[PDB]
Structure formats: C-alpha cells, structure tokens
Amino acid sequence: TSALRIRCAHCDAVFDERALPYDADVDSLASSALREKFVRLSLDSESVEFLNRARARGRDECERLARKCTELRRTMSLTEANAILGRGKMFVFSDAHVETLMRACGEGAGGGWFLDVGAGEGEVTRTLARRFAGTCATESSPGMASRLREKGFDVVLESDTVENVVRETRARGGDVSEDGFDVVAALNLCDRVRSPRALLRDLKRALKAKTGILILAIVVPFRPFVENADGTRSQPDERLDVPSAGSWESGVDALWTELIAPLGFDLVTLSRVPYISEGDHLYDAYVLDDAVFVLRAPP
Incomplete structure (x- = not known):
C-alpha cells in the first residue's frame, strides 16, 4: 500500500521532483534590488518529462551508453562524447519559463537577434531561439559546431571567445545590428571560464545600448x-568574494556585488531553477542549484 522502509547506511541521497527548490528567502538578501526583482518559477510537465527520459530509456540501455561514453572520451571531452551518443542532455529552461521571463524584460514578442554562448548542442536554448528571426551560436568544438548549423542556427561561430562576436557574425551572413545583439544567453559558463569579469565585459559590448x-x-x-x-x-x-558553500541566498548576494553589479547592469528579474542533467541506469537525473539573472544593458 506504500513504499518500503529499508534502513541502510550506503544508499546515498535520493529525492523526488517535489523536493527541487524553486523559491528562496526574499528578506534574507542584503541587496535591496535582489528582493523586489525576484520571480518564483515552478515545476511543469515539460521539466518532469525531462526527468523520466532515463526511466523510459531502459536500465540496460543507459548502461550501454555509459560504458560506450567512457570508452569514447579517451580521445575527446565528456560533452563531445554525449553528443555523439545522444545522452547527457542538459535542461534549464522550459517553454513556460521562457514566456514568463520574456514578458518581464519587455521584449516578450518574437523578433530580433539572439546569441547563445557555449551552446554545443543548443538543446537548453532550443525553446528560446524559436522567437528570434536571427539566431547565432558560439562553440569551440568543431563537431558540435556543425550540429548547430543543422538545427536552425543561422550563424555558428567556431570559437571560444566573444571579443568581436558582433562583427564576426556579420561576416558570415549574420544580418545583426551593428550596435550589438538584442538578447544574449550565457548559461552556466562563469564557473568554467578563466576571467569572469572579462567575460561579462565582452558580453556587455556585444549587446545594444539601453535595449x-x-x-x-x-x-x-x-x-x-x-x-x-x-x-x-x-x-x-x-578570486571573487563568493563563498564556495553555504546557502543559495548567500551566493546570489555575493555574486550580485563584486561581479555582476560593478558591470553596471539593470536587474530585470531574478529566478531560481534547477540545473537538471539527464540520468542513467543509477539515478533518474542529476540536479544542481542554478540562479538566473536577467539584466538590461546600460545606455
């Protein structure tokens, strides 16, 4: 009539979909702008559908891909091996999450140019790129760059920098404005790059003024x-003054100042979504805590 109650001391930690945190303590933020500009997202059928991809794939099949992935990544990275096998997909935003934040930044209707930094597979930003008439992507992997040119991206720059991204896109047929892109997405990249400040400075000069x-x-x-x-x-x-542990609210207020705020952006909305990774034969999904900052470029 109910689940089994088995006491063990080596079964790791396992949660369900309802335990995924989507909100946070608003009044526990020293920054004033972070409190009022918070929009609480929630679960949806699109995010739960991604959680059951490992279950509907089969345990024996998830084991065959896992063994083949470790054998493939002897000559390549982990992300490149997953793209060849069609596993290890990443999920952050759902379509309902898109319409919520797009209406918050003013540019809710479709149209304009979009730039996806570090796409590789672009599945995370797939539902978002459906609105823009022109889509661009930057990926340093040659094999994954060719995959992006087949999924709908008009221009795919095969590089890991964004110094002259607004100018190099126009050289490959990207009819983007000379003053920068409209919307640019940098999803989960500051923890991998070497200079996070220089990244946001390059992301700043790649956007339009004001809008x-x-x-x-x-x-x-x-x-x-x-x-x-x-x-x-x-x-x-x-060495950014950001703690390597603690709560989600302390890291946001630490990442807001010192790093994001000194760039001179205008915080549109702040949200908390789970960083879902596709599961396998052991777990249904691997999840990390992710924070989403929607910013408006200064004049």
Whole structure:
C-alpha cells in the first residue's frame, strides 16, 4: 500500500521532483534590488518529462551508453562524447519559463537577434531561439559546431571567445545590428571560464545600448575552476568574494556585488531553477542549484 522502509547506511541521497527548490528567502538578501526583482518559477510537465527520459530509456540501455561514453572520451571531452551518443542532455529552461521571463524584460514578442554562448548542442536554448528571426551560436568544438548549423542556427561561430562576436557574425551572413545583439544567453559558463569579469565585459559590448537583454546563469554554490586540456587542472585567477558553500541566498548576494553589479547592469528579474542533467541506469537525473539573472544593458 506504500513504499518500503529499508534502513541502510550506503544508499546515498535520493529525492523526488517535489523536493527541487524553486523559491528562496526574499528578506534574507542584503541587496535591496535582489528582493523586489525576484520571480518564483515552478515545476511543469515539460521539466518532469525531462526527468523520466532515463526511466523510459531502459536500465540496460543507459548502461550501454555509459560504458560506450567512457570508452569514447579517451580521445575527446565528456560533452563531445554525449553528443555523439545522444545522452547527457542538459535542461534549464522550459517553454513556460521562457514566456514568463520574456514578458518581464519587455521584449516578450518574437523578433530580433539572439546569441547563445557555449551552446554545443543548443538543446537548453532550443525553446528560446524559436522567437528570434536571427539566431547565432558560439562553440569551440568543431563537431558540435556543425550540429548547430543543422538545427536552425543561422550563424555558428567556431570559437571560444566573444571579443568581436558582433562583427564576426556579420561576416558570415549574420544580418545583426551593428550596435550589438538584442538578447544574449550565457548559461552556466562563469564557473568554467578563466576571467569572469572579462567575460561579462565582452558580453556587455556585444549587446545594444539601453535595449539590451542579457541572460546569465551561474551554478550556486560558485566553485570556479578552469580546465586547460587533457589531464591538466588549473585554478581561476580572479578570486571573487563568493563563498564556495553555504546557502543559495548567500551566493546570489555575493555574486550580485563584486561581479555582476560593478558591470553596471539593470536587474530585470531574478529566478531560481534547477540545473537538471539527464540520468542513467543509477539515478533518474542529476540536479544542481542554478540562479538566473536577467539584466538590461546600460545606455
């Protein structure tokens, strides 16, 4: 009539979909702008549908892909091996999450140019790119860059920098405005890049003045570490005053100041969504705590 109550000491931690945190303590933020500009998102059938992808795939099938992935990544990275096998997909935003934040930033209706930094597979930003008449993407992987040119992206820049992204897009047929893109998404990239300040500065000069929407996602807690190449682990140079542990509210207020706020952005809305990763034969999904900052470019 109910689940089994088995007392163990080595079964790890397991939660359901209702335990996923979507809200936070609003009054526990020293920054005033972070309190009123908070929009609480929630679960939906699209996010739950992503959770059951490992269950509907089969345990024996999730084991075949896992063994083949470790065998493939001897000569490539982890993300490149998952794209070849069609596993390890990432989920952050649902279609309902899109219509909520797009109406909040003013540019709710479709149209304009969109830039996805670090897309690779673009499945995370797939529902978002349906609104813009022009879509661009930047990915340093050659194999994954060719995949983006087949899914609907008009221009796919095969590089890991965004110094002259607004100018290099126009060189490849990207009929984007000379003053920058309209909306740019940098989802879960500050924990991997070396210079997070120089990244936001490059993201700033890539947007239009005044009317310039920026979508930034950072995993909380913020543990920055840069991977050089194969078997070469490094450390970030910019020591941001952000705790490596603690609660979600402390990391947001620490990432707001010191890093995001000194850039001079206008906070449109702040939300808390789970960073869902596709499961396998052991767990249905792996989830991290993610924070979403929607910013407007200064004049």
